[PDB]
Write a protein that binds this DNA or RNA. Structure first.
Length: 1095
DNA sequence: TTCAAAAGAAGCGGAGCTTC
């Protein structure tokens, strides 16, 4: 109550009166914010924050005094102090630009003079900054404390924002641009991942500014001002940065790409500092000075990151105690620099790292235009990765003499799907380059005898890094394969690394020696293996060799196998038993390992299996159209085009069709996760086109090396055996492209029909500019869709089983129906509140609701059970942050541009999201969380969602714990969890309360195609309750299967490599039984257990 | 309709329709 005179004492001269019922100009800053109970920011109360902080940053002594700490970060030395001095001089220029822009704004259209007359311009979308100005003679001026504090925030953001941005994928870019995901032009995604959208830039900037202001939002102030003022400030700071060239604004015209797309979309990119700029060694000095509890910082020694209370971007959802425990365990792990890898990276040098692991130096005219763009994006990813690692090493180097002795902690958070994600773009969990330089793994091994376990472990890690598939063969067979590699092809690289580990020197042909020796095995962890093997060779005491080399306990087809175990709800089938065996669940085979399975029982994993099913399904398709020669020819051309450019499609001379497990890897995965067939066809086409674009660079590179080469030899020389032999491949290519782009298959009445597009590919090929775009991509996609993907989809269903497919449909419908009601009720209750506000004279259209009001509405939906609980996890599928609820601008810059949509935390339609949320969450999500908190939880690992890096000392026990954690997560019942929540929803939902658009969306999920048209509320309600029943039955089934599976002897090795499977000790023995006998026995127990329930 | 985060710009006027 007396908070009023409290924030007034601090800002006594802001224009206007802090009373919403006052008649003149009202000051919405003092209305929106309060002094906090405990200090959040050290600039609160300061009359000149830029001056005060500049002085604080001017010496180590003055910094320590300002932050009230006895010692400052040692990275804050002389060179870095000088760079921050210069950056403080620059913040003064930003402050100066901001002041001139306010002056321009007050003058134009006499806004200042009208504001002075009583016009409420501080409530316009452009005028919310007038809430932090002060009267100055005949005009107004910024309150200096707020302006400068905001500039300090602007500077910190400028320093570290790019390194904290989300990665954008194809789907993201498709949503942003409004362009179909399957039709995105090459490198467009790259351009958008390189920039920030307006929303992206402004929201992160607004966050920082509001945090530096160090105040609390008033629960009863309108969001229009609580989000609005800091956003308006952010917008002006972005605008200033564009003037100063700290940020480059590029307005990307979508009509240059797709001619009827009228969206123009702004992209903002922060001008990078030099890699060797001292400030990179310590880029958080301002943050750590301004904030009492800084966010951005590195964690050295026993400085442990705090544990997040809520899910990542889901403040409505508290991390459960079990989850918090898991975050605590992972944050506690110490990581250490492996000096030799760092020294290797440095000695190779950024340029050679790029030549080796990226695209090297691009000759933009030996390159096809589209190929050149993926090449850029490849370099980008490696180079930022390199620079980021080296910035971190620069700060670690200051902490101590020996960088390998400095312990490093990483912050983590639980995501929406229950995964423990390391914060930051470039860390060990997320960046392969960094993963081999900063490691939690470490062991002291006795490698003096090649016959002991320590050496075997060592071999296992070398071989897995060297791309030998170690889960498919026993340790012994692995050992021999590794030896053949080390003694053969890898030897000259090994010799080179031996020398490197002696003199510190690399030859000038280092890239060629590495590249040649490694071939397709090339990777960052391979470089580690060559390093560790050569370090071993020259080691003085082999009996105590110290190494961070790891073995990853890696999930075998983890997602699909989890789904099959978690949500198959029928009787047991022998196909299921055989298939689930491919993912490490073995029945009646005590101690059986994945290595033994693959070597003696079944060499086909789930990917191979579906590929084989696709071959059958392709056969069936070719038969139903056996006489249709145009259709036969069209399938032949697709298969030919794939054969020409993809390694996984083999066409032999017999016409024989061999398909490798690889083509099915992504399509199997994303299919279980709700992906439609069209999106799959697109990705397939995208890999075909990518290889073609590449081959076009191969042409230019052979046309320059011998301008007499024939076209066919330039394009297919490296792929053919002769001159005329290459000629027929060129003939296949041109023919395939011709027929696949001029003719598409369409489904009519259940039958495929060929149709002309009239936009077939015609013309002499120009290898530099050559581009499949538009109506031709779509054509390829249509062919890919009906002749390959649809058979593949059938293959997948036959593989993972139709029961699973059925569960996931029901899960999808239920969570979708639920999210539709939530989203629609939320929007309506919002409109009801806004209709009240219109009677309030203090309220203006644009102010929107208060947080308290929004919280009330969010709470009024609890009886619809928006959350899903498991006991250890909480999922909020509908949860989102969107612009559709407020549907209005939040603020603009002082030039009437940079219009930021008012985004509100609110439920939105799930789509198919319920599927991967529950699968990933109760699958690998639950498993890793279990692995982190279980009794005897493995220490010193790096967990990467479905795989775990383990030090060579602990590979046996950690692996067994991992398979035990798998078993624990297989006791889960996600469909039950959805059931519990959906049934509560079903007894509180009023379907008549819904808008017609929401009522129609529900019809789509709950009804067959026919009943949609004109169905009553009671129709779609009766349908929505049918789904509940379906869920109830599935969940009852999963529950019993699980109990029954536990009564039987199981050996689980889903987290494979090491050969250490978990045994459940089921007492019922099913050894010496075929899958058919086993299925009969499990089903007997099933029907037994069913009658347990009834009676 | 795969998940892990959203997301057009800008004149005139003072919101929100409008044209690109």
């Amino acid at each position: 109550e007396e908070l009023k005179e409290g924030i007034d004492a601090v800002y006594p001269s802001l224009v206007g009166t802090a009373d919403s019922k006052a008649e003149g100009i009202k000051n919405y800053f003092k209305l929106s914010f309060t002094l906090p109970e405990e200090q959040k920011s050290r600039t609160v109360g300061s009359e000149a924050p830029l001056k005060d902080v500049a002085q604080a940053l001017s010496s180590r002594a003055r910094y320590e005094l300002f932050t009230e700490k006895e010692t400052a970060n040692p990275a804050f030395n002389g060179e870095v102090i000088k760079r921050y001095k210069e950056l403080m001089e620059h913040g003064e220029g930003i402050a100066d630009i901001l002041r001139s822009r306010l002056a321009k704004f007050l003058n134009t259209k006499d806004v200042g003079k009208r504001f002075a007359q009583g016009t409420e311009a501080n409530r316009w979308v452009g005028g919310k900054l007038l809430n932090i100005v002060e009267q100055d003679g005949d005009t107004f001026k910024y309150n200096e404390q707020l302006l400068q504090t905001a500039v300090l925030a602007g500077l910190q953001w400028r320093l570290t924002a790019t390194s904290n941005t989300a990665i954008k994928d194809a789907k993201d870019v498709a949503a942003i641009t409004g362009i179909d995901q399957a039709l995105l032009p090459e490198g467009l995604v790259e351009q958008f991942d390189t920039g920030m959208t307006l929303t992206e830039a402004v929201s992160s900037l607004a966050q920082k500014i509001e945090s530096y202001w160090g105040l609390s939002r008033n629960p009863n102030a309108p969001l229009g001002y609580t989000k609005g003022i800091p956003t308006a400030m952010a917008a002006e700071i972005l605008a200033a940065f564009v003037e100063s060239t700290d940020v480059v604004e590029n307005i990307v015209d979508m009509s240059e790409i797709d001619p009827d797309n009228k969206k123009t979309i702004g992209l903002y990119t922060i001008t990078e500092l030099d890699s060797f700029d001292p400030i990179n060694s310590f880029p958080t000095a301002i943050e750590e000075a301004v904030l009492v509890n800084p966010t951005e910082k590195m964690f050295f020694g026993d400085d442990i990151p705090p544990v997040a209370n809520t899910q990542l971007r889901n403040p409505a959802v508290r991390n459960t105690p079990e989850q918090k425990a898991a975050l605590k365990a992972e944050q506690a792990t110490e990581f250490y620099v492996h000096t030799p890898m760092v020294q290797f990276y440095e000695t190779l040098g950024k340029d050679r790292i790029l030549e080796l692991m990226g695209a090297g130096t691009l000759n933009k005219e030996l390159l096809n235009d589209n190929h050149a763009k993926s090449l850029e994006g490849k370099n980008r990813s490696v180079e930022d990765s390199y620079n980021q690692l080296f910035s971190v090493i620069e700060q670690v180097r200051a902490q101590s003499e020996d960088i390998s002795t400095v312990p490093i902690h990483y912050a983590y958070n639980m995501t929406r799907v229950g995964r423990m994600q390391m914060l930051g773009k470039y860390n060990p969990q997320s960046a392969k380059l960094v993963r081999e330089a900063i490691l939690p793994t470490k062991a002291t091994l006795d490698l003096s005898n090649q016959n002991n376990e320590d050496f075997s472990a060592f071999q296992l890690g070398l071989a897995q890094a060297l791309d030998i598939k170690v889960h498919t063969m026993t340790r012994e067979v692995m050992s021999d394969e590794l030896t053949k590699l080390l003694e053969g092809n890898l030897k000259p690289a090994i010799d080179m690394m031996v020398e490197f580990n002696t003199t510190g020197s690399l030859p000038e042909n280092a890239v060629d020696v590495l590249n040649t020796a490694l071939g397709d095995r090339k990777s960052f962890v391979a470089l580690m293996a060559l390093m560790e093997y050569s370090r071993y060779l020259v080691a003085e005491d082999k009996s105590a060799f110290v190494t961070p080399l790891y073995v990853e306990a890696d999930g075998v087809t983890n997602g699909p196998i989890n789904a099959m175990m978690l949500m198959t709800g029928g009787l047991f089938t022998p196909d299921w038993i055989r298939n689930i065996a491919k993912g490490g669940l073995f029945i009646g085979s005590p101690n059986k390992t994945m290595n033994e399975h693959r070597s003696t029982a079944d060499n086909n994993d789930l990917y191979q299996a579906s590929t084989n099913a696709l071959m059958e399904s392709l056969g069936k398709l070719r038969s139903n159209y056996a006489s249709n020669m145009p259709i036969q020819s069209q399938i032949d051309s697709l298969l030919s085009l794939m054969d020409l450019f993809l390694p996984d499609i083999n066409l032999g001379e017999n016409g024989a069709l061999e398909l490798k497990r690889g083509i099915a890897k992504n399509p199997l995965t994303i299919t279980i996760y709700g992906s439609g067939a069209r999106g799959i066809a697109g990705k397939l086409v995208s890999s075909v086109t990518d290889a073609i674009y590449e081959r076009m660079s191969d042409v230019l590179k052979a046309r320059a090396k011998d301008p007499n080469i024939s076209a066919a030899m330039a394009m297919f020389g490296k792929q053919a055996a002769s001159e005329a032999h290459a000629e027929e491949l060129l003939a296949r290519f041109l023919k395939d492209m011709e027929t696949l782009t001029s003719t598409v298959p369409v489904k009519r009445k259940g039958v495929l029909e060929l149709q002309s597009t009239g936009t077939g590919a015609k013309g002499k090929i120009n290898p530099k500019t050559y581009t499949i775009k538009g109506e031709q991509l779509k054509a390829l996609q249509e062919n890919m869709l009906h002749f390959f993907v649809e058979p593949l989809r059938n293959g997948i269903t036959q593989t993972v089983g139709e029961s699973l497919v059925y569960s996931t449909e029901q899960l999808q419908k239920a969570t979708q129906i639920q999210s539709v009601v939530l989203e629609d009720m939320f929007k309506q209750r919002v409109q009801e509140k806004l209709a009240e506000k219109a009677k309030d004279p203090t309220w203006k259209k644009g102010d929107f609701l208060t947080q308290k009001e929004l919280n009330d509405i969010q709470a009024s939906l609890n009886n619809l059970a928006p959350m899903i609980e498991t006991g250890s996890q909480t999922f909020y599928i509908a949860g989102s942050e969107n612009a559709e609820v407020a549907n209005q601008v939040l603020a603009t810059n002082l030039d009437d541009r940079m219009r930021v949509p008012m985004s509100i935390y609110a439920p939105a339609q799930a789509g198919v999201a319920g599927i991967p949320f529950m699968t990933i969450g109760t699958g690998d999500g639950m498993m890793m969380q279990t692995l982190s908190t279980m009794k005897g939880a493995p220490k010193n690992t790096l967990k990467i969602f479905d795989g775990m890096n383990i030090g060579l000392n602990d590979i046996t026990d950690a692996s067994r714990k991992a398979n035990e954690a798998v078993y624990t997560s297989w006791q889960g019942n996600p469909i039950k969890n959805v059931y519990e929540s959906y049934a509560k929803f079903m007894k509180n939902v009023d379907f008549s309360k819904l808008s017609p658009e929401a009522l129609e969306a529900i019809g789509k999920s709950a009804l067959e195609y026919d009943q949609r048209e004109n169905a009553t509320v009671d129709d779609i309600a009766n349908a929505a309750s049918l789904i509940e029943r379906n869920l109830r039955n599935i969940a009852l089934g999963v529950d019993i299967r699980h109990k029954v599976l536990d009564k039987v002897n199981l050996s689980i090795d889903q987290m494979a490599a090491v050969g250490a499977p978990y045994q459940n000790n089921g007492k019922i023995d099913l050894s010496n039984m075929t899958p058919e006998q086993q299925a009969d026995e499990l089903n007997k127990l099933f029907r037994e257990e069913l009658e347990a329930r009834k009676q």
